Amino acid sequence: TKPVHLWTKPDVADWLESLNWGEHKEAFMDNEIDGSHLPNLQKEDLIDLGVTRVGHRMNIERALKQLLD
Amino acid sequence: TKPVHLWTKPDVADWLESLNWGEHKEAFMDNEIDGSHLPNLQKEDLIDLGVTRVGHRMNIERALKQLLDR
Amino acid sequence: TKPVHLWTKPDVADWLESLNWGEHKEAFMDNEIDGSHLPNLQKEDLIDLGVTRVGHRMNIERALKQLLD
Amino acid sequence: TKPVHLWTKPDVADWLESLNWGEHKEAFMDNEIDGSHLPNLQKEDLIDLGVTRVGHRMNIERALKQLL
Amino acid sequence: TKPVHLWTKPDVADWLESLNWGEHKEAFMDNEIDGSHLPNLQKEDLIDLGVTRVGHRMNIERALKQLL
Amino acid sequence: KPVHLWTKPDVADWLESLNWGEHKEAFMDNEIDGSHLPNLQKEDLIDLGVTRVGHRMNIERALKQLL
Ligand SMILES: [Cl-]
Ligand SMILES: [Cl-]
């Protein structure tokens, strides 16, 4: 399995789609988010990426932290 | 009773109604608040969820801390 | 290569181009960024310089570390 | 969205791949094609870039104008 | 993994070991430190818990700020 | 199957079996089959997209055992 730190920008878009978060793939792509960034995103980054719903963002944050395992 | 961390989004709405805070049901549901979020909500989160009255917000903050010992 | 602390303002523009970041030349030049400033550039500075896209900004922060560290 | 006129040479390569036209990334990269050029390429430019199959080139020309 | 606010006292012990700070397990255990307390510990709490070396304490404070 | 008869899909299955599926596409794209697998050197693996150092040495180790 490809490790997260090597995921490309399309790999990140595929990850979002796998979790039914494709609504954010355009913003993540336009902001050039790849796997070297993904597990290190903070609350303010996700707001800048258009993730605004409180519980929704906390869910994404949780999933992001899990990628560190 | 169900532990807080397993509360669904409807379960959280039920909790708000139990404490006569049903005015915030819609915002909590639209923001997908479930029990895995409740004890970690901070002032700014509550403001984003429409809890703007000062003393009212403080009362909710107290009830959230209480979830840690229920 | 010329040491970074000696880089002129055009030297910083060349570096931006060398990494396909020429879209930021005008802002860096207008703000008078030279080599003596590159080790002091923080996130807020880069945002002031027009680097707003999230992953793109973290890519520039990474390259600055690679250039100087 | 990043405007086309600011696409870098890698951005153009990624665009080619995205449309399964990756066979031409090397030529576009070697010829320093970026977003400032992409929407202005003509038939003869595309031929110089290795895009020789007729219908295939016509499809790229169609996409290049939809970038606008 | 498990959210920090749910961590039991043994869970906090496991976290300390995971960062090679096992010298502080029994003190954290005896003081009944669990996840509900962990992120809110201050300098004087850590000193009360036996975390005395300056840099070593700053390192623990940094990790605490990260689990939160 | 013996290794030197492995098809391109056979090599892909091998990578999958070792949870190295991230290299399926490049190995398939580069037309790697059993007749090539044993003769792959460090620079061939790099050309095939194998950049993690220790991981690459793990693959090289398995390629020898494949013999
Ligand atoms: Cl062609
Ligand atoms: Cl690799």
Residue numbers in the entry:
A (entry chain A), C (entry chain C): 1780 to 1848
B (entry chain B): 1780 to 1849
D (entry chain D), E (entry chain E): 1780 to 1847
F (entry chain F): 1781 to 1847
Source paper text:
In the presence of Zn2+, the SAM-domain polymerizes into helical fibers, which may be stacked side-by-side through interhelical contacts.
On the other hand, we could not readily generate crystals from the L1800W mutant SAM domain. Structural comparison between the crystals structures of WT and of the L1800W mutant SAM domains shows that the bulky side chain of the Trp induces a shift of the C-terminal helix, locating it further away from the Zn2+ cluster. Furthermore, H1835 adopts a different conformation for its side chain, as well as the side chain of R1832. As a result, the Zn2+ binding site is altered or possibly destroyed. While the intrahelical contacts are partially maintained in the L1800W mutant, the interhelical contacts are completely lost as no neighboring molecule is observed at the appropriate position in the crystal. As a result, Zn2+ affinity is reduced to the effect that no Zn2+ is found in the mutant protein, whereas WT SAM domain keeps partially attached to its bound Zn2+ during the purification and crystallization procedure. The p.L1800W variant severely delays the kinetics of Zn2+-dependent polymerization of the Shank2-SAM domain.
